[PDB]
């Protein structure tokens, strides 16, 4: 049950099972006793979704805070996404009387800098609860849902699925959520769907969630971040019990080296995707392996990442980013990760004066670590010197290239290397500085 709450400034958690109501008729219990709240999740799409559902189920229409859109109604309840409490500039003063910390099991980098956030700064702001919800807390093992049966795939049916087979009979009719490992898997099987007749359709950033329609038969192939929370009235989800995590590797060569694999699923993730069915109403869940992975600590990686965005998308100086982390790992109960803060925020403190032209499209282009990808760029267009490769990566020194010759000044390694390296660089020496004392 929902945590009370006194005068006095509390953190709290809320751990319960996938489409109980830790979203929805948690924070509508709150409001009814008269507070003002605020519920951050990781997805745009299920914030979207919140204000349309509590709308016409409970009696309320939230406000709606996304990057692109915000929707004031005035109501006592705000659903946001991270990413836009964070680029508004954290906690509003005075705003709320409690904020939810929704799914906070999600290790991506937004959100653990959106949560060290509220850690570091909800007191201040004026608010009397913080809660922490999930239904997947630190440790946990998945169990039986009651509204889902589970079901193994086989090699009976038509369609490949990651070393099984998916049965068209059982994703001809109704609405079906099925999850791949990357974006190119997603076209590939909504692809052949497509060909056999289906009505699939991908989804994964980038994409707009009108894609999906609301209702009506459809086959949605989609990756995890936008489907975080997500309610998309699915009789059923098809999972390649599989993910792609990131790590990084200090291969000393010049210096780390930031790389992605492919590996099967932990807890956390068969039973969030799992739980995307079932949802008030009977589902079915269909998986290619059974077990699981334990659900420990989270990469290194992505604590760099975190500073990367700080500086890319946030304007927090490396320092800044350290408090809210510090927070972050400081309080009971969060995913944990290697104590490695006080590295990663010296190498970003000597990575100054980036070129504003390149950082911006980086940032425009979407790729993983906007910041260190620019830097790169900045040192070579300063040295006159070419990119580690001509990959799509390094396309914001095209114009250059004519004058780009010589080795490249490597700082790190974020993809294949292809022209001659070269590791006297200031800036090279000055992180292999930060790895060695
Ligand atoms: N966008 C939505 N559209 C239709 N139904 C929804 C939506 N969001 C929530 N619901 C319903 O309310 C229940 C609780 O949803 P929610 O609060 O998101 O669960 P959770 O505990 O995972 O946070 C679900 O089982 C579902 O039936
Ligand atoms: F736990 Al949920 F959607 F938030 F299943
Ligand atoms: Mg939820």
Not at 174 to 203: P, Q, T, W
Not at 281 to 301: A, K, L
Request: with cysteine; aromatic share 8%.
């Amino acid at each position: 049950s929902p945590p009370a709450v006194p005068q006095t400034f509390q953190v709290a958690h809320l751990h319960a099972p996938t489409g109980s109501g830790k979203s929805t008729k948690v924070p509508a219990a709150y409001a009814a006793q008269g507070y003002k709240v605020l519920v951050l999740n990781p997805s745009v799409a299920a914030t979207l979704g919140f204000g349309a559902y509590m709308s016409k189920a409970h009696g309320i229409d939230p406000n709606i805070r996304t990057g692109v859109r915000t929707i004031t109604t005035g109501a006592p309840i705000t659903y946001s996404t991270y990413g836009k409490f964070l680029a508004d500039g954290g906690c509003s003063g005075g705003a709320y009387d409690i904020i939810i910390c929704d799914e906070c099991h999600s290790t991506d980098s937004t959100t653990i800098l959106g949560i060290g956030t509220v850690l570091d700064q909800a007191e201040t702001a004026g608010a009397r609860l913080v809660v922490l919800a999930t239904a997947t807390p630190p440790g946990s093992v998945t169990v039986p849902h009651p509204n889902i049966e589970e079901v193994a795939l086989s090699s009976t049916g038509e369609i490949p699925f990651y070393g099984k087979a998916i049965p068209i009979e059982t994703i001809k009719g109704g609405r079906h959520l099925i999850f791949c490992h990357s974006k190119k898997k997603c076209d590939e099987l909504a692809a052949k769907l497509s060909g056999l007749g289906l009505n699939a359709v991908a989804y994964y950033r980038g994409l707009d969630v009108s894609v999906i329609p609301t209702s009506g038969d459809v086959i949605v192939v989609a990756t995890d971040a936008l489907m975080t929370g997500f309610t998309g009235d699915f009789d059923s989800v098809i999972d390649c019990n599989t993910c792609v995590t990131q790590t990084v590797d200090f291969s000393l060569d010049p210096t780390f080296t930031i790389e992605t694999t492919t590996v099967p699923q932990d807890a956390v993730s068969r039973s969030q995707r799992r739980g995307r069915t079932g949802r008030g109403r009977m589902g079915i869940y269909r998986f290619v392996t059974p077990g699981e992975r334990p659900s420990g600590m989270f990469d290194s990686s992505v604590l760099c990442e975190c500073y990367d965005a700080g500086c890319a998308w946030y304007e927090l100086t490396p320092a800044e980013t350290s408090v809210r982390l510090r927070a972050y790992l400081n309080t009971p109960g969060l995913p944990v990760c290697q104590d490695h803060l006080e590295f990663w925020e010296s190498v970003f403190t000597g990575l100054t004066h980036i070129d504003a032209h390149f950082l911006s499209q980086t940032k425009q282009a979407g790729d993983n670590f906007p910041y260190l990808v620019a830097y790169q760029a900045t040192v070579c267009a300063r040295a006159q010197a070419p990119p580690p490769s001509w990959d799509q990566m390094w396309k914001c020194l095209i114009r250059l290239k004519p004058t780009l010759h010589g080795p490249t000044p490597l700082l790190y390694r974020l993809g294949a290397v292809q022209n001659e390296v070269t590791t006297t660089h200031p800036i090279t020496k000055y992180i292999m500085a930060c790895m060695s004392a």
